[PDB]
């Protein structure tokens, strides 16, 4: 089995990925690291197999890599769309420089190295319907700019520096564990919570604005399957992967169908809209399907049923 | 009062040298300050100030002291060097660019940072390559220049910064020798023809590349920098001069000197890089938006180069 190091591992993806890999390869084979100490209530709090690491600190990163001798590296820290627009300097510092450190370390310590990209790599010239893997990239966010960098330098390391870098363009990832906040694609989790509370929701994304989205189990399944794939099957370094595409109105309909009662939504455009409009409406993921057998288990209604069952248990909202 | 106050960084290299001279002639010597990491060699053509653009405080100090209205940020590690020294290429080409853009934003400068055909890779559509296409550069240099284009565009769009750029072809000039490696064969071939010695060419005999003679390159950059914001529909523009292969340039030189030139093709790293680059470029946006034009065809460039190199470098006529 692999020895796995995850960095930025206390966040939305890192937490679930830590859990899934421990269950698949055993607890002792996974070390999770993060800038910050796990909060008291955090699923990974107090567990063995946690170490602090600021990925901006190259010596500290190398030290932990030499200590633990991982064979797989999941480099997850980045500043995303909304926070990046407000703190562009931080976004560039983290998204560019930590990326460089991860790649240099995967090279020299011969690790299989996953650094996720995002649909934010795309802009309004991408060809928004069934967006291809190879297209025009003109991201409108600093985040997206840094993620184009990540893709291109990672690909360069794969082609010219003998480094086993692997990546997907994630759509927005939905999870029952996440507290709704100010994120570009957070409206969906807000909708599910408001449905359960029976409260009105003010949505900042336009009512008919479609986005590619992905349910957390399908995302984790895809990452793990990509990381297990034979190099011989990987015709490219970066793959689009998709779950489904929906608009706020569509998600609302899925929720109302499941609950058999109305969800009250009011559409007031927020900062998320301008970001969302600049992203694809849907993704073409045929290359991931063909090369390495990417697939998904959840459609929208199945995600909606799962979310409405999980949220009451995980957060203590009213159950259906 | 309408005359631009110009700061050039990385100014002692191939482009900076001729750009400084062109701007002094256009606007007066007092209006241009050139700066570089290294100090001017004895026989260097070059109004000078030392500046390491990696030192952000020093860069800000010079900007605050001189108060330029135009900034030309020229330092970068180019294709061939960048393959050998990827760390340095990434440090300089990413971080010095960041410094330039932040200073151009805060001190309200019109900010030129050049890109290159090296931003393209083998998926760009090699014939008449468009401004908007797939970018898959094969060099770390090209990766850093896509970054440059994308972050500069982001600053123009969202950070109120007057960032302007062109994708330069291979630039040919008689004065300062090139630093880049890849398209340098053209200049080397002229020198060899004049010395009457055999040239060893690292690029495949029939590999076409976009090239551009320095006066057209500079005329274009200057015209872009003079353009109103209103006519600029994009931040980054392909500009083109001509497209040729090594053997076509060999023929141009031979026709002008009326004697043969010995060339031996030994395909090296430069060929792999060159083959990933466009064969020719589409510059219709630059022509449409701000009136880009050129005056030199290959024959005229050849005529100029063979007459100018001996005068500047004391080679035989
Ligand atoms: N969640 C999504 O929908 C989504 C979509 C596309 C791409 N992605 C990519 O997935 C990755 C992880 O996303 P996420 O939602 O889990 O992020 P998150 O914000 O939930 O967590 C990121 C983690 O990085 C840590 N971190 C920040 N700076 C650090 C540093 N200097 N050193 C070490 N750790 C540091 C944070 O403390 C945090 O625990 C990012 O690269 C992101 O761009 C996520
Ligand atoms: N010449 C070409 O054909 C060509 C083609 C495409 C794009 N470009 C771009 O034009 C720009 C200038 O190219 P060039 O051919 O004049 O390069 P050059 O190598 O001839 O000159 C680069 C100059 O930058 C200086 N420099 C390096 N590090 C520095 C630092 N830290 N601070 C300050 N100065 C520093 C060097 O000392 C040198 O004088 C580069 O961005 C290059 O990518 C050039
Ligand atoms: K969209
Ligand atoms: K070519």
Numbering used by the authors:
A (entry chain A): 13 to 332
B (entry chain B): 11 to 56, 61 to 331
Article sentences:
Crystallographic structures of recombinant TcTDH without natural ligands (apo-TcTDH) and in complex with NAD+ and acetate (holo-TcTDH) were determined and refined to 2.1 and 1.73 Å resolution, respectively. The two protomers in ASU correspond to the homodimeric biological unit. For the holo-TcTDH, the initial 12 residues from chain A and the initial 10 residues from chain B were omitted. In chain B, residues 57 to 60 and the terminal residue from the C-terminus were excluded from the final model. The catalytic domain exhibits a α+β fold and regulates access to the catalytic site through displacement of Loop-1 (residues 190–194), which is observed in open and closed conformations in chains A and B of the holo-TcTDH structure, respectively. The potassium-binding site is situated opposite to the catalytic site. In TcTDH, K+ is observed in octahedral coordination established through interactions with residues in the catalytic domain (Glu-221, Pro-222, and Ala-288) and cofactor-binding domain (Trp-291, Pro-292, and Asp-293). Four interactions are established between K+ and the main chain carbonyl of Pro-222, Ala-288, Trp-291, and Pro-292, and two interactions with the side chain carboxyl of Glu-221 and Asp-293. Indeed, our results confirmed that TcTDH is activated by K+ and to a lesser extent by NH4+.
In this parasite, threonine degradation pathway occurs within the mitochondrion, where the amino acid is initially oxidized to 2-amino-3-ketobutyrate (AKB) by a NAD+ dependent L-threonine dehydrogenase (TDH, 1.1.1.103) and then cleaved into glycine and acetyl-CoA by a 2-amino-3-ketobutyrate coenzyme A ligase (AKCL, 2.3.1.29). Finally, we report the crystal structure of TcTDH and characterize its allosteric activation by potassium. The cofactor-binding domain adopts a characteristic Rossman motif and contains both catalytic residues, Thr-130 and Tyr-155.
